[PDB]
């Protein structure tokens, strides 16, 4: 039905009408005993019409419409990427779903997500209706419906009560593996964007420059328990492809942890003996000691026994202030040597894997959250920036280029003398340029990686 009373037509109805017209004409002609030269043509046209109705285009030409588009037949309804199987039976659109743009939540825990309350009000509407009717605020369904439509002050308390422990499913397309859908506990937030934990983005292959995500709500008890026990992000710590951790820190966290665990030759507060990590933190926050100063700290560490009991040992360690500060985050059962170095991405991943293999699942989750928090805090505190003067050019670059150009010129003159072939000259020039590039790279990297300090 279209505006103005016009009803138009459909392809299937058109094909049926053509078949019916041909059949009626053939019946009338056979009843009157028409000459065979006409009835044979009518029978051929009826056969063509039936063929078009069943599978249009398979036999010779295809019957088209006004816009020269072939009509869709029953086979077109059944098969193809737009057919029943692939569009309506293997996948479908569902209720209780939404989508929006994603931002970063740096404060969240690993099992939590940030959901706008405008989305949550629509998503959990029948739950809110039931809860309103349960505690006497509404006596009928229409009263609760009107109360929710007005968005009164008590419906927000009801919504906060109904979503307290009820996981939701977050999904980002394309879903390449089963880690593309994960379950989270919602936290109601203001705004219109979904907040995502930084440590799950690698599993989603997501970044915060325009990506959108979809959200689904489990309804039955079985679905909620499956979401909690099978699909929660706190259960998806290891990779099903190779068994390695997938919640490893990256970028800012790595930069902060690396910055706080480096040492400097002559830093403020160097050479003092401390009673423990807390004294180191007090000295750093008071401005009395540097993060990179090399000191001696009393450290107590625990190791699991043969039967699995933690036995403690205390000793003086030569370390830095930042390593002692970071040691307060490590759980009991790990050696102190796991932090007494400059920690890069691989070191942090190995530390997380060691924690998971030795202690289990829950300490690993707590450790990962603490690592992310500390990395963000100290990356912010460092003040790391990028400037044009950071890209230092080696001073020998022009000399190397001039030497390569001189070699190219001399070999070109040698070729012009007729001593070598064209391909040999081409290969020699390429080799000369490759050697010059390697020399320039080595000089630049040798200049960049070291600095001079006063003892």
């Amino acid at each position: 039905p279209l505006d103005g009373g016009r009803f138009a037509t459909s392809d299937l109805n058109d094909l049926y009408r053509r078949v019916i017209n041909r059949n009626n004409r053939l019946k009338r002609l056979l009843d009157l005993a028409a000459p065979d030269i006409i009835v044979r043509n009518e029978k051929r046209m009826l056969q063509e019409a039936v063929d078009a109705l069943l599978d249009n285009g398979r036999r010779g030409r295809a019957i088209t419409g006004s816009n020269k588009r072939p009509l869709k037949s029953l086979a077109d309804m059944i098969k193809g990427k737009q057919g029943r199987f692939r569009q309506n039976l293997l996948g479908k659109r569902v209720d209780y779903s939404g989508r929006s743009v994603i931002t970063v939540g740096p404060y969240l825990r690993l099992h939590q997500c940030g959901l706008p309350k405008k989305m949550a009000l629509e998503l959990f509407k029948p739950f809110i209706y039931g809860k309103l009717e349960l505690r006497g605020l509404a006596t009928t369904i229409k009263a609760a419906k009107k109360m929710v439509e007005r968005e009164e002050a008590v419906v927000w308390d009801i919504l906060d009560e109904v979503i307290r422990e009820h996981p939701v499913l977050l999904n980002r397309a394309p879903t390449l593996h089963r880690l593309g859908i994960q379950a989270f506990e919602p936290v109601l937030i203001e705004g219109k964007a979904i907040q995502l934990h930084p440590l799950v983005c690698a599993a989603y292959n997501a970044d915060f420059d325009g990506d959108q995500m979809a959200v689904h709500v489990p309804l039955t008890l079985e679905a909620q328990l499956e979401a909690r026990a099978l699909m929660m992000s706190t259960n998806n710590i290891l990779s099903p492809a190779n068994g390695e951790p997938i919640i490893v820190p990256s970028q800012d966290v790595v930069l902060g942890l690396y910055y706080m665990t480096r040492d400097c030759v002559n830093a403020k507060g160097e050479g003092m003996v401390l009673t423990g990590p807390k004294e180191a933190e007090r000295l750093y926050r008071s401005g009395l000691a540097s993060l990179h100063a090399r000191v001696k700290v009393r450290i107590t560490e625990y190791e699991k026994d043969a039967n699995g009991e933690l036995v403690a040992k205390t000793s003086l360690k030569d370390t830095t202030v930042g390593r002692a500060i970071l040691w307060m985050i490590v759980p009991k059962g790990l050696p102190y040597s796991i932090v007494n170095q400059a920690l890069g991405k691989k070191a942090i991943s190995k530390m997380l894997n060691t924690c998971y293999r030795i202690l289990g699942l829950k300490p690993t989750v707590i450790f990962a959250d603490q690592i992310m928090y500390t990395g963000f805090a100290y990356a912010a505190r460092s003040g790391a920036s990028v400037g044009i003067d950071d890209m230092v050019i080696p001073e020998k670059k022009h000399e190397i280029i001039s030497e390569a150009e001189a070699e190219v010129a001399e070999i070109q003159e040698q070729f012009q003398s007729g001593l070598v072939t064209a391909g040999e000259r081409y290969n020699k020039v390429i080799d000369i340029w490759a050697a010059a590039n390697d020399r320039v790279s080595k000089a630049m990297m040798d200049n960049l990686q070291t600095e001079t300090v006063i003892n």
Binding site: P1, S10, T140, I141, K142
Partner: protein, 101 residues
């Protein structure tokens, strides 16, 4: 091509009937009553027709009256009224006594 489903008055009334604590007999009576409602909101048959359409002799007319009274308070108020006077009185019964006239 395909269109979309539309909600009519009877669809809304049956949606409200679904979420109302009726019994099976009351639910069947409500189904018949909603079936007997036109697009202006008035009842088109006497309650005798509904009682006969229920199909059992264990049900009296006062149960049908009670179910009809419960239905008449659905949204919109005054729906399934017997006549104009009934609709006006049902609409008035939802007003507070502080109304001047």
């Amino acid at each position: 091509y395909q269109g979309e489903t539309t909600q009519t008055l009877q669809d809304y009334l049956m949606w409200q009937v679904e979420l109302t604590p009726f019994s099976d007999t009351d639910r069947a009576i409500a189904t018949s009553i909603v079936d007997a409602v036109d697009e202006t909101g008035y009842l088109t048959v006497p309650l005798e027709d509904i009682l006969e359409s229920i199909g059992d002799e264990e049900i009296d007319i006062d149960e049908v009256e009670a179910v009809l009274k419960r239905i008449q308070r659905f949204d919109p108020v005054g729906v399934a009224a017997k006549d104009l006077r009934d609709c006006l009185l049902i609409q008035l019964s939802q007003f507070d006594k502080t109304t001047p006239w």
